[PDB]
């Protein structure tokens, strides 16, 4: 009665404030800069080791070893340069949605329909990779987990909540309960102080790690969000939804800047990543291929069609050399 | 030229041979998604199988290794995880026949059934359909008329006509009848008939998949 009307008045207040600060769109600004979008990138490596669809992959900071998790119960850690499968971790529950690679390189994470984040210590004195920790505090399936450190990990599950965990303790320290829909993706700022989460309410919420309270909320999409990715500055992030439109959001401005949408594609974005500088935005579609948008001018520049099925995940290396796209055809192809 | 990473490539081919063996072992065993609108009806049949997230139930019947995947305990948005089960063999859709009395649940089961049948991922998946609580349904027919949940239906309060009408209404829901065939079975007290029907249905779906691969169908 009164409280819902107060919420509507506060939402109209923040919408009017972020409309009043919006005076010149970025498309008006970007007409002066030189369009250097048009590129061609051939596939250099085709990582053939999976017998089922690859749901996720992540890149190490050294940018040679990349984890890759598929439905055959296998989390294969590949060597990118020499095409060598370094590790092949067997999975207790083969139904995975995600995987992560620690910044130190010591640990990997994994999770899926078993709603349990399993963390695997790689560098051990025995030969085999053992289950380091087994985090069981979520009700819904995990969708994206990311290592802050070797000791802390964030997760985002289908029980509407995200969770900061301490790994050696084994229990969730911070719980993030702002979303109303199922949280599909996480991405961390490069200082690892704050992150953003895209959920199925078409709302990307910026959380801070230390405090544990929702700082910002970005509600610009019509359909549910599948992919989120920070800008290399850390002051912006792109958002890929099923509405065929991936749109950049500015944190300091606190609304949309621009939308990357083409007319002929009605397909959905599954994976969003940025290059090292951030001039071009990678975007994996379920049109069985991937696109490369000029992230300042919104012109579809590159087309990466080497995949026989929809690309689930893609990752850009930390040094920015290559971009590896893992699809449902059980192939992870390293474009460059 | 390769100095000591020849041994790393030997490691890659060794674990790759282990991946090939694990993939053949996992493709050996048949996978069965187990859906339903109520937990008790699915619990009744999964307690009749041979001796927190998804619940994997690995058993074996007539040298055929089944993996039931009960997901209905997990409560989340179904469209985001449903595409995990694209390469599944069969969906055992369980539904209790006494659900129409309480609250409307039969229409919820119809909506869930229409959603899984007209899902774009299960265009090839020929599904099994269990109609649970047969004795309880006989008692509900003896006590209550069936015309409450079906306004269109007009008929006698007998088990033989009403159960066949419910089976026909469930079988009528799929738009695509060419590819997938909705096998249907009434749940009995004996576990032998249920496991035998699952074996016969999955055997027919395996033979249809093999002839789809060979190219006769």
């Amino acid at each position, epitope marked *: 009665d009164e409280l819902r009307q107060e919420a509507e008045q506060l939402k109209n207040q923040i919408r009017d404030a972020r409309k009043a600060c919006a005076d010149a769109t970025l498309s008006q600004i970007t007409n002066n800069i030189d369009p250097v979008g048009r590129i061609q990138m051939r596939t250099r490596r085709t990582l053939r080791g999976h017998l089922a669809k690859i749901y996720a992959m992540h890149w190490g900071t050294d940018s040679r070893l990349l984890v890759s998790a598929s439905q055959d119960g296998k989390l294969i850690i590949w060597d990118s340069y020499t095409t*060598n499968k370094v590790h092949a971790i067997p999975l207790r529950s083969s139904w995975v949605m995600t995987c992560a690679y620690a910044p130190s390189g010591n640990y990997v994470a994994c999770g899926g329909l078993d709603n349990i984040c399993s963390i695997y210590n790689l560098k051990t*004195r025995q030969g085999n990779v053992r289950v380091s920790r087994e985090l069981a505090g979520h009700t819904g399936y995990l969708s994206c987990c990311r290592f802050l450190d070797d000791n802390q990990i964030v997760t985002s599950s289908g029980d509407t909540t995200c969770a900061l965990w301490d790994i050696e303790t084994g229990q969730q320290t911070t719980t993030f309960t702002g979303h109303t829909g199922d949280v599909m993706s996480l991405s961390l700022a490069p200082d690892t102080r704050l992150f953003v989460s895209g959920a199925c309410d078409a709302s990307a919420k910026l959380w801070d790690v230390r405090e544990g309270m929702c700082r910002q909320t970005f509600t610009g999409h019509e359909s549910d969000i599948n992919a989120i990715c920070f800008f290399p500055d850390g002051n912006a992030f792109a958002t890929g939804s099923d509405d065929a439109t991936c749109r950049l959001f500015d944190l300091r401005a606190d609304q949309e800047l621009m939308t990357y949408s083409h007319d002929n594609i009605i397909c959905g974005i599954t994976s969003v990543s940025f290059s090292k500088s951030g001039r071009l935005l990678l975007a994996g579609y379920d049109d069985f291929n991937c696109n490369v948008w000029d992230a300042l001018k919104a012109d579809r520049a590159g087309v990466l069609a080497g995949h026989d099925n929809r690309v689930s995940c893609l990752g850009v290396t930390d040094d920015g050399m290559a971009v590896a796209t893992g699809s449902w055809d059980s192939f992870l192809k390293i474009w460059n | 030229l390769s100095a*000591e990473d020849k041994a790393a490539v030997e490691r890659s081919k060794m674990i790759d041979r282990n991946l090939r063996e694990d993939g053949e072992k996992a493709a050996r065993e048949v996978k069965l998604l187990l859906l339903g609108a109520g937990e008790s009806g699915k619990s009744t049949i999964v307690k009749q199988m041979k001796i927190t997230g998804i619940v994997e139930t690995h058993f074996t019947f007539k040298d055929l290794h089944f993996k039931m995947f009960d997901v209905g305990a997990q409560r989340s948005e179904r469209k985001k995880w449903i595409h995990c089960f694209e390469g599944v063999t069969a969906i055992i859709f369980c539904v209790a026949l006494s659900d129409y009395d309480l609250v409307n649940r039969m229409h919820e089961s119809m909506k869930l059934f229409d959603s899984i049948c007209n899902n774009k991922w299960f265009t090839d998946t020929s599904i099994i359909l269990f109609l649970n609580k047969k004795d309880l349904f006989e008692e509900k027919i003896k006590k209550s008329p069936l015309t409450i949940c079906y306004p269109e239906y007009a008929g006698s309060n007998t088990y033989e006509e009403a159960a066949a009408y419910i089976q026909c209404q469930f079988e009528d829901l799929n738009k695509r009848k060419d590819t997938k065939e909705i096998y249907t079975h009434f749940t009995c007290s004996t576990e032998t008939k249920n496991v035998q029907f699952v074996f016969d249905a999955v055997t027919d779906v395996i033979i249809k998949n093999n002839l789809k691969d060979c190219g006769l169908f």
Partner: single-chain antibody, 232 residues
């Protein structure tokens, strides 16, 4: 982790002998296995190798034919069958564990060794220094001259520093000259350019007193150094 050798003792020259390396406490089938001999008051020397999964066997050029190495994976035991034993084979035989992938630290854990007394084109690793007495608490520099340029085309220069203590088995000190092994203190710097290699110890301790072995891992056969002994 535990590697226990068995089968040593006094062997008549020309006789046959089987050595059993019982492995315990690690995934044995995923480790390549080495034998490394050490003659009394002489440097280390490689003998033989089996790749993980019994795929690619190797032997030293000077002992080829007489030694037959085999691996038993369910029982987790490395067998070394020996025939036509000469007077040169009286040595301590170490059963060495190694693993080969990107970022792996091979030659990490060494067996205790077995004493076997017999009655009666290679990359030369010039260890020019024999012994230097150094007072503890001082920075120590050990040089290593190699005959072939160990800098491979892929980038990682293959050279392993080992420390052997008096009365103890040798252990991996540094692998690939820029990477410390798991469990070594943070005092061992490696610096290598082309064929010149340098080990730097910032603070010398009583545990660091021993013989340093410079071993190249570019081509088979694997060649060790003569050794650099320290005396406190």
């Amino acid at each position: 982790v535990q590697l226990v050798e068995s089968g040593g003792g006094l062997v008549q020259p020309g006789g046959s002998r089987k050595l059993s390396c019982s492995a315990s406490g690690f995934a044995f089938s995923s480790f390549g296995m080495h034998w490394v001999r050490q003659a009394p008051e002489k440097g280390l020397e490689w003998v033989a190798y089996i790749s993980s999964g019994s795929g690619t066997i190797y032997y030293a050029d000077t002992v080829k034919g007489r030694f037959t190495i085999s691996r038993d994976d369910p029982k987790n035991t490395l067998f070394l069958q020996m025939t036509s034993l000469r007077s040169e084979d009286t040595a301590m035989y170490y059963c060495v564990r190694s693993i080969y992938y990107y970022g792996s630290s091979p030659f990490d854990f060494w067996g205790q060794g077995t004493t076997l007394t017999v009655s009666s084109s290679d990359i030369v690793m010039t260890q020019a220094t024999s012994s230097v007495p150094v007072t503890p608490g001082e920075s120590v520099s050990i040089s290593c001259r190699s005959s072939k340029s160990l800098l491979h085309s892929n980038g990682n220069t293959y050279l392993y520093w080992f420390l052997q203590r008096p009365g103890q088995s040798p252990q991996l000190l540094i692998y690939r000259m820029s990477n410390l092994a798991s469990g070594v203190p943070e005092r061992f710097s490696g610096s290598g350019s082309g064929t010149a290699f340098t080990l730097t110890i910032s603070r010398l301790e009583a545990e660091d007193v021993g013989v340093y072995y410079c071993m190249q891992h570019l081509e088979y056969p694997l060649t060790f150094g003569a050794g650099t002994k320290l005396e406190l």
